[PDB]
Design a protein around this motif. Sequence first.
Motif, short mmCIF file in Angstrom:
data_model
loop_
_atom_site.label_atom_id
_atom_site.label_comp_id
_atom_site.label_asym_id
_atom_site.label_seq_id
_atom_site.Cartn_x
_atom_site.Cartn_y
_atom_site.Cartn_z
N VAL A 255 0.84 -1.21 0.00
CA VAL A 255 0.00 0.00 0.00
C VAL A 255 0.88 1.27 0.00
O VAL A 255 1.99 1.25 0.54
N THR A 256 0.38 2.36 -0.60
CA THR A 256 1.10 3.65 -0.63
C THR A 256 1.04 4.31 0.76
O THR A 256 0.18 3.95 1.57
N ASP A 257 1.95 5.29 1.05
CA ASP A 257 1.96 6.02 2.34
C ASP A 257 0.61 6.74 2.57
O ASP A 257 0.19 6.91 3.72
N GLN A 258 -0.07 7.13 1.46
CA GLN A 258 -1.39 7.76 1.52
C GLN A 258 -2.47 6.72 1.87
O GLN A 258 -3.30 6.97 2.75
N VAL A 259 -2.43 5.54 1.21
CA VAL A 259 -3.40 4.46 1.42
C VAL A 259 -3.20 3.81 2.82
O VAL A 259 -4.18 3.45 3.48
N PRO A 295 -8.07 4.92 -4.30
CA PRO A 295 -7.02 3.87 -4.36
C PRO A 295 -7.29 2.72 -3.38
O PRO A 295 -7.11 1.55 -3.74
N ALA A 296 -7.73 3.04 -2.14
CA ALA A 296 -8.06 2.03 -1.13
C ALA A 296 -9.34 1.27 -1.50
O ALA A 296 -9.51 0.11 -1.12
N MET A 297 -10.24 1.93 -2.26
CA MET A 297 -11.51 1.33 -2.70
C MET A 297 -11.27 0.33 -3.87
O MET A 297 -11.89 -0.74 -3.90
N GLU A 298 -10.36 0.69 -4.82
CA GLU A 298 -10.07 -0.13 -6.01
C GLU A 298 -9.28 -1.41 -5.64
O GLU A 298 -9.59 -2.49 -6.15
N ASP A 299 -8.24 -1.28 -4.77
CA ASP A 299 -7.40 -2.43 -4.38
C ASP A 299 -8.10 -3.29 -3.28
O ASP A 299 -7.47 -4.18 -2.70
N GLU A 300 -9.43 -3.05 -3.04
CA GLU A 300 -10.27 -3.84 -2.12
C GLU A 300 -9.69 -3.85 -0.67
O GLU A 300 -9.64 -4.92 -0.04
N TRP A 301 -9.34 -2.67 -0.13
CA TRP A 301 -8.91 -2.54 1.27
C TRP A 301 -10.06 -2.04 2.14
O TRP A 301 -10.11 -2.34 3.33
N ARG A 318 -15.92 0.94 6.09
CA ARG A 318 -15.41 -0.08 7.03
C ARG A 318 -14.41 -1.02 6.32
O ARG A 318 -14.56 -1.30 5.13
N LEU A 319 -13.35 -1.46 7.05
CA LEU A 319 -12.28 -2.29 6.46
C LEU A 319 -12.76 -3.73 6.12
O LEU A 319 -13.72 -4.22 6.72
N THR A 320 -12.07 -4.39 5.16
CA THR A 320 -12.36 -5.78 4.76
C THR A 320 -11.19 -6.70 5.17
O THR A 320 -11.06 -7.04 6.35
N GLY A 321 -10.33 -7.04 4.21
CA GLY A 321 -9.14 -7.84 4.46
C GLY A 321 -7.94 -6.98 4.80
O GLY A 321 -6.96 -6.95 4.04
#
Length: 325
Positions: A255-259, A295-301, A318-321
């Motif tokens: 993950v990026t420093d932003q994500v 970015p967090a939505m596309e990579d399924e975080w 809310r978080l997933t995996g």
Amino acid sequence: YQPPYTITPAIVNLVAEIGEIIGRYTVLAEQNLTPRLRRENRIRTIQASLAIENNTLTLEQVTAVIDGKRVLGHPREIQEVRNAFATYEAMEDWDASVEGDLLAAHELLMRGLVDETGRYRSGGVGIFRGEQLVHMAPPADRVPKLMADLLDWLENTNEHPLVASCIFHYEFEFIHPFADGNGRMGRLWQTLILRNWKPLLAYLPVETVIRDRQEDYYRVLAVADSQADATPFVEFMLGALRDAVREAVSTDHQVTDQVAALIRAIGGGELSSNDLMQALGLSHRPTFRNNYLNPAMEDEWIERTQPDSPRSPTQRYRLTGKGQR
């Protein structure tokens, strides 16, 4: 002087396989080995090497000792770990053929635990090979010459490091030059002879294989001692090293420093766009949507609390995996 080194078709096949496996273990697999992974392996090496010499600390405990975390156990066993970690971290300084470097290593390993540190034993010592009958090592007055010859041989040997490390281990175990810690010094110096060839092998936890094959290890070592031939021991060790460097490549196949900041901001609860905006200290909305939320939505975080209504004003996340450390 030369130890009983006689090659066999099994050795050349093990050298060929180890060589090829390292040919892969390097490439870009070296650009995956992070400092934490080097430490994980180093902790496994220390825990197993000490476990062979009847240290009752677990891997979880040895990790906590080296991490600096809370540790409940015997102070002598905990100091064995601290000294061992200190000793392996100082390998960069040593050349396996230098007698002074061998003594400097024994000093770091045994500091505060034993009387005779950083010098050869003044008296006799018993050789232990597991649940096998104890026998005496060579007289203390023979050790200086035996060790001088062995270290001179190692410096001027034409044998490949893989073989030379096994031969040295076998000879060193027979001599038992120190009053204590000969077993641990044997495995240490074998790692040194290998890292003097390829420094990545300093993080090869072959000691976990030797610990699990402990009964066979001491039996092959005793049979090789009885028949006065290093060959079967070299086959065993090159075999263990192959199996070790083989289970090292199987573990492999961000993950990026932003994500990363957004995942930590959500945690367990459900945060809205304005809840994340305040937590991340952002003030530019297009930057939050493009560099953080999407970015967090596309990579399924992260997922939506209202997936049926994507463009919702009461939208929360809310978080997933998402695994922390």
